[model samples]
Target chain A: HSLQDPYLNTLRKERVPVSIYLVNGIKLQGQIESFDQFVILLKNTVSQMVYKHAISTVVPSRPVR
Target chain B: GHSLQDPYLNTLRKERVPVSIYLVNGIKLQGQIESFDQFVILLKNTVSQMVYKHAISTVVPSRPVR
Candidate 1:
Protein backbone atom coordinates (compact mmCIF):
# COMPACT_ATOMS: atom_id res chain seq x y z
CA HIS A 1 0.00 0.00 0.00
CA SER A 2 1.06 3.56 -0.67
CA LEU A 3 1.00 6.44 1.73
CA GLN A 4 1.32 9.35 -0.68
CA ASP A 5 -0.84 8.50 -3.64
CA PRO A 6 -3.57 11.13 -3.27
CA TYR A 7 -1.39 13.75 -1.63
CA LEU A 8 1.38 13.76 -4.21
CA ASN A 9 -0.94 13.13 -7.12
CA THR A 10 -3.12 16.05 -6.19
CA LEU A 11 -0.14 18.34 -5.98
CA ARG A 12 1.10 17.26 -9.38
CA LYS A 13 -2.30 17.48 -11.01
CA GLU A 14 -2.83 20.97 -9.65
CA ARG A 15 0.72 22.11 -10.49
CA VAL A 16 1.17 23.37 -6.96
CA PRO A 17 4.36 24.94 -5.69
CA VAL A 18 5.76 22.87 -2.86
CA SER A 19 8.49 23.15 -0.30
CA ILE A 20 10.27 19.90 0.37
CA TYR A 21 12.44 19.45 3.39
CA LEU A 22 15.14 16.83 3.65
CA VAL A 23 16.25 14.85 6.67
CA ASN A 24 19.08 17.27 7.29
CA GLY A 25 16.64 20.23 7.22
CA ILE A 26 17.68 21.45 3.80
CA LYS A 27 14.77 23.00 1.95
CA LEU A 28 14.01 22.67 -1.75
CA GLN A 29 11.17 24.32 -3.64
CA GLY A 30 9.49 23.31 -6.86
CA GLN A 31 6.35 22.01 -8.49
CA ILE A 32 5.63 18.30 -8.53
CA GLU A 33 6.11 17.47 -12.20
CA SER A 34 5.82 13.78 -11.53
CA PHE A 35 6.58 11.06 -8.99
CA ASP A 36 7.00 7.34 -8.53
CA GLN A 37 7.84 4.85 -5.84
CA PHE A 38 11.46 5.95 -5.43
CA VAL A 39 11.76 9.42 -6.93
CA ILE A 40 10.06 12.69 -7.71
CA LEU A 41 10.62 14.96 -10.67
CA LEU A 42 10.50 18.45 -9.25
CA LYS A 43 10.27 21.35 -11.66
CA ASN A 44 11.73 24.82 -11.24
CA THR A 45 14.73 26.67 -12.70
CA VAL A 46 15.87 23.19 -13.54
CA SER A 47 14.15 19.80 -13.19
CA GLN A 48 15.45 17.83 -10.25
CA MET A 49 15.07 14.13 -9.62
CA VAL A 50 14.81 13.82 -5.86
CA TYR A 51 15.01 10.51 -4.14
CA LYS A 52 12.10 9.73 -1.88
CA HIS A 53 14.41 8.31 0.76
CA ALA A 54 15.96 11.72 1.25
CA ILE A 55 12.72 13.59 1.67
CA SER A 56 11.28 14.46 5.06
CA THR A 57 8.17 16.43 4.21
CA VAL A 58 6.37 18.08 1.26
CA VAL A 59 4.45 21.26 1.90
CA PRO A 60 2.12 22.75 -0.65
CA SER A 61 1.79 26.46 -1.12
CA ARG A 62 -1.94 26.21 -0.57
CA PRO A 63 -4.36 23.78 1.00
CA VAL A 64 -5.29 20.81 -1.15
CA ARG A 65 -8.76 19.54 -2.13
CA GLY B 1 -2.13 -1.42 -3.03
CA HIS B 2 1.06 -3.04 -1.87
CA SER B 3 4.24 -1.08 -2.39
CA LEU B 4 7.95 -1.50 -1.81
CA GLN B 5 7.77 0.32 1.50
CA ASP B 6 5.35 -2.13 3.05
CA PRO B 7 7.52 -5.15 2.36
CA TYR B 8 10.74 -3.44 3.39
CA LEU B 9 9.25 -2.18 6.64
CA ASN B 10 7.54 -5.47 7.30
CA THR B 11 10.77 -7.32 6.77
CA LEU B 12 12.51 -5.08 9.26
CA ARG B 13 9.77 -5.66 11.82
CA LYS B 14 9.67 -9.40 11.23
CA GLU B 15 13.44 -9.65 11.53
CA ARG B 16 13.54 -7.37 14.58
CA VAL B 17 16.17 -5.08 13.11
CA PRO B 18 17.40 -2.17 15.10
CA VAL B 19 16.99 1.00 13.12
CA SER B 20 18.00 4.60 13.11
CA ILE B 21 15.32 6.84 11.66
CA TYR B 22 16.23 10.27 10.40
CA LEU B 23 13.57 12.93 10.57
CA VAL B 24 13.13 15.97 8.36
CA ASN B 25 14.24 18.38 11.01
CA GLY B 26 17.60 16.64 11.46
CA ILE B 27 16.60 14.49 14.37
CA LYS B 28 17.87 10.94 14.57
CA LEU B 29 15.72 8.40 16.40
CA GLN B 30 16.91 4.96 17.37
CA GLY B 31 14.47 2.10 17.78
CA GLN B 32 13.10 -1.09 16.34
CA ILE B 33 10.18 -1.26 13.97
CA GLU B 34 7.06 -1.97 15.96
CA SER B 35 4.38 -1.47 13.35
CA PHE B 36 3.30 0.75 10.43
CA ASP B 37 0.31 1.75 8.42
CA GLN B 38 -0.34 4.12 5.55
CA PHE B 39 0.50 7.33 7.36
CA VAL B 40 2.58 6.37 10.39
CA ILE B 41 5.01 3.96 11.95
CA LEU B 42 5.48 2.90 15.55
CA LEU B 43 9.06 2.61 16.70
CA LYS B 44 9.89 1.01 20.00
CA ASN B 45 12.85 1.97 22.14
CA THR B 46 12.04 2.38 25.83
CA VAL B 47 8.61 3.46 24.66
CA SER B 48 6.75 3.44 21.37
CA GLN B 49 6.85 6.61 19.34
CA MET B 50 4.31 7.26 16.63
CA VAL B 51 6.30 8.61 13.72
CA TYR B 52 4.44 10.22 10.90
CA LYS B 53 5.60 8.96 7.52
CA HIS B 54 5.65 12.46 6.12
CA ALA B 55 8.26 13.43 8.69
CA ILE B 56 10.64 10.59 7.98
CA SER B 57 13.68 10.72 5.75
CA THR B 58 15.64 7.48 5.96
CA VAL B 59 15.77 4.21 7.84
CA VAL B 60 19.09 2.54 8.54
CA PRO B 61 19.12 -0.94 9.96
CA SER B 62 21.86 -2.03 12.37
CA ARG B 63 22.44 -5.16 10.33
CA PRO B 64 22.22 -5.54 6.59
CA VAL B 65 18.77 -6.53 5.47
CA ARG B 66 18.55 -9.93 3.84
Candidate 2:
Protein backbone atom coordinates (compact mmCIF):
# COMPACT_ATOMS: atom_id res chain seq x y z
CA HIS A 1 0.00 0.00 0.00
CA SER A 2 2.98 2.31 0.14
CA LEU A 3 4.72 4.02 -2.76
CA GLN A 4 1.86 2.90 -4.98
CA ASP A 5 0.22 6.18 -5.75
CA PRO A 6 -2.51 4.87 -8.04
CA TYR A 7 -4.09 2.47 -5.56
CA LEU A 8 -3.69 4.95 -2.76
CA ASN A 9 -5.60 7.47 -4.80
CA THR A 10 -8.40 4.97 -5.38
CA LEU A 11 -8.67 4.22 -1.70
CA ARG A 12 -8.99 7.91 -0.95
CA LYS A 13 -11.33 8.66 -3.82
CA GLU A 14 -13.64 5.74 -3.33
CA ARG A 15 -13.39 5.65 0.46
CA VAL A 16 -14.22 2.01 -0.07
CA PRO A 17 -13.60 0.03 3.06
CA VAL A 18 -11.31 -2.97 3.03
CA SER A 19 -10.20 -6.00 4.98
CA ILE A 20 -6.56 -7.03 4.86
CA TYR A 21 -6.07 -10.74 5.10
CA LEU A 22 -2.93 -12.05 6.71
CA VAL A 23 -1.14 -15.36 6.28
CA ASN A 24 -1.93 -16.14 9.90
CA GLY A 25 -5.62 -15.85 9.01
CA ILE A 26 -6.13 -12.52 10.68
CA LYS A 27 -8.20 -9.88 8.92
CA LEU A 28 -7.67 -6.23 9.64
CA GLN A 29 -10.59 -4.00 8.79
CA GLY A 30 -9.58 -0.40 8.19
CA GLN A 31 -9.12 2.51 5.80
CA ILE A 32 -5.87 3.54 4.25
CA GLU A 33 -3.92 6.46 5.64
CA SER A 34 -0.64 6.18 3.72
CA PHE A 35 2.13 3.67 2.96
CA ASP A 36 5.81 3.11 2.19
CA GLN A 37 7.86 0.24 0.83
CA PHE A 38 7.33 -2.01 3.82
CA VAL A 39 4.38 -0.64 5.75
CA ILE A 40 0.74 0.24 5.27
CA LEU A 41 -0.59 3.13 7.29
CA LEU A 42 -4.17 2.49 8.35
CA LYS A 43 -6.83 4.01 10.58
CA ASN A 44 -10.09 2.73 11.96
CA THR A 45 -11.26 3.12 15.53
CA VAL A 46 -7.52 3.34 16.22
CA SER A 47 -4.22 3.58 14.37
CA GLN A 48 -2.50 0.32 13.42
CA MET A 49 0.49 -1.18 11.64
CA VAL A 50 0.46 -3.64 8.74
CA TYR A 51 3.59 -5.22 7.40
CA LYS A 52 3.68 -6.14 3.72
CA HIS A 53 5.07 -9.64 4.03
CA ALA A 54 2.37 -10.80 6.44
CA ILE A 55 -0.34 -9.72 4.06
CA SER A 56 -1.85 -12.51 2.01
CA THR A 57 -4.87 -10.71 0.61
CA VAL A 58 -6.57 -7.31 0.57
CA VAL A 59 -10.21 -7.19 -0.37
CA PRO A 60 -13.35 -5.10 0.14
CA SER A 61 -14.97 -5.74 3.48
CA ARG A 62 -18.49 -6.99 3.90
CA PRO A 63 -21.11 -4.26 3.54
CA VAL A 64 -21.23 -2.19 6.70
CA ARG A 65 -24.71 -1.01 6.00
CA GLY B 1 -9.37 -25.46 5.79
CA HIS B 2 -10.32 -25.99 2.15
CA SER B 3 -12.36 -23.92 -0.33
CA LEU B 4 -15.19 -26.19 0.86
CA GLN B 5 -13.77 -27.62 4.04
CA ASP B 6 -13.68 -26.27 7.56
CA PRO B 7 -11.92 -28.37 10.21
CA TYR B 8 -12.69 -26.55 13.41
CA LEU B 9 -16.43 -27.15 13.55
CA ASN B 10 -16.05 -30.86 13.07
CA THR B 11 -13.27 -30.99 15.62
CA LEU B 12 -15.52 -29.18 18.06
CA ARG B 13 -18.49 -31.35 17.39
CA LYS B 14 -16.58 -34.53 17.77
CA GLU B 15 -13.31 -34.33 19.66
CA ARG B 16 -13.84 -31.01 21.44
CA VAL B 17 -10.13 -30.37 21.13
CA PRO B 18 -8.65 -27.80 23.41
CA VAL B 19 -7.10 -24.93 21.48
CA SER B 20 -5.28 -21.68 21.71
CA ILE B 21 -6.39 -18.79 19.52
CA TYR B 22 -3.73 -16.24 18.73
CA LEU B 23 -4.20 -12.69 17.57
CA VAL B 24 -2.09 -10.41 15.42
CA ASN B 25 -2.06 -7.76 18.16
CA GLY B 26 -0.47 -10.41 20.37
CA ILE B 27 -3.33 -11.49 22.59
CA LYS B 28 -4.05 -15.15 23.23
CA LEU B 29 -7.09 -17.10 24.46
CA GLN B 30 -7.11 -20.78 25.31
CA GLY B 31 -10.31 -22.81 25.22
CA GLN B 32 -12.41 -25.15 23.14
CA ILE B 33 -14.72 -24.29 20.27
CA GLU B 34 -18.14 -23.72 21.76
CA SER B 35 -19.65 -22.74 18.43
CA PHE B 36 -18.97 -20.96 15.12
CA ASP B 37 -20.45 -19.71 11.87
CA GLN B 38 -19.71 -17.60 8.78
CA PHE B 39 -18.34 -14.63 10.72
CA VAL B 40 -17.62 -15.63 14.29
CA ILE B 41 -16.50 -18.35 16.66
CA LEU B 42 -17.22 -19.00 20.30
CA LEU B 43 -14.63 -20.60 22.53
CA LYS B 44 -15.24 -21.84 26.04
CA ASN B 45 -13.09 -23.01 28.88
CA THR B 46 -13.92 -23.46 32.57
CA VAL B 47 -13.33 -19.79 33.26
CA SER B 48 -14.21 -18.11 29.95
CA GLN B 49 -16.12 -18.36 26.72
CA MET B 50 -14.99 -15.86 24.10
CA VAL B 51 -16.48 -14.87 20.76
CA TYR B 52 -14.12 -13.68 18.03
CA LYS B 53 -13.07 -14.23 14.47
CA HIS B 54 -11.79 -11.40 12.31
CA ALA B 55 -9.38 -10.16 14.94
CA ILE B 56 -7.66 -13.53 15.17
CA SER B 57 -4.31 -14.59 13.74
CA THR B 58 -4.71 -18.36 14.02
CA VAL B 59 -5.98 -21.23 16.15
CA VAL B 60 -3.91 -24.26 17.01
CA PRO B 61 -4.28 -27.39 19.04
CA SER B 62 -2.67 -26.45 22.34
CA ARG B 63 -0.57 -29.59 22.43
CA PRO B 64 2.22 -28.13 20.28
CA VAL B 65 3.53 -29.11 16.82
CA ARG B 66 6.08 -31.74 17.79
Best by the lDDT measure: 1
Error of 1 at B4 (Å): 21
User: Which parts of model 2 have CA positions greater than 4 angstroms off?
Assistant: A1-65, B1-5, B64-66
True contacts preserved, each candidate?
Answer: 0.20, 0.00
Q: In candidate 2, what are the lDDT values of residues A1-65, reduced to their tens digit? A: 12134444566457667776675767788887776666777789987888866664444443211
Going through the candidates in order, what is chain B's TM-score? 0.93, 0.71
Candidate 1: residue A22 lDDT (0-100): 70
Give the i-RMS of model 2 in Å: 13.6
Docking quality level of the chain pair in candidate 2: incorrect
Report clash pairs, candidate 2: A2-A35, A2-A36
lDDT, candidate 1, B1-66, per-residue tens = 767888999999999999999886768888898777787676776645446687887899998996
Instruction: Extract clashing residue pairs from model 1.
Output: A1-B1, A1-B2
| Model 1 alpha-carbon miss at residue B49, Å | 19
Candidate 1 chain B least-lDDT 10 residues = B43-52
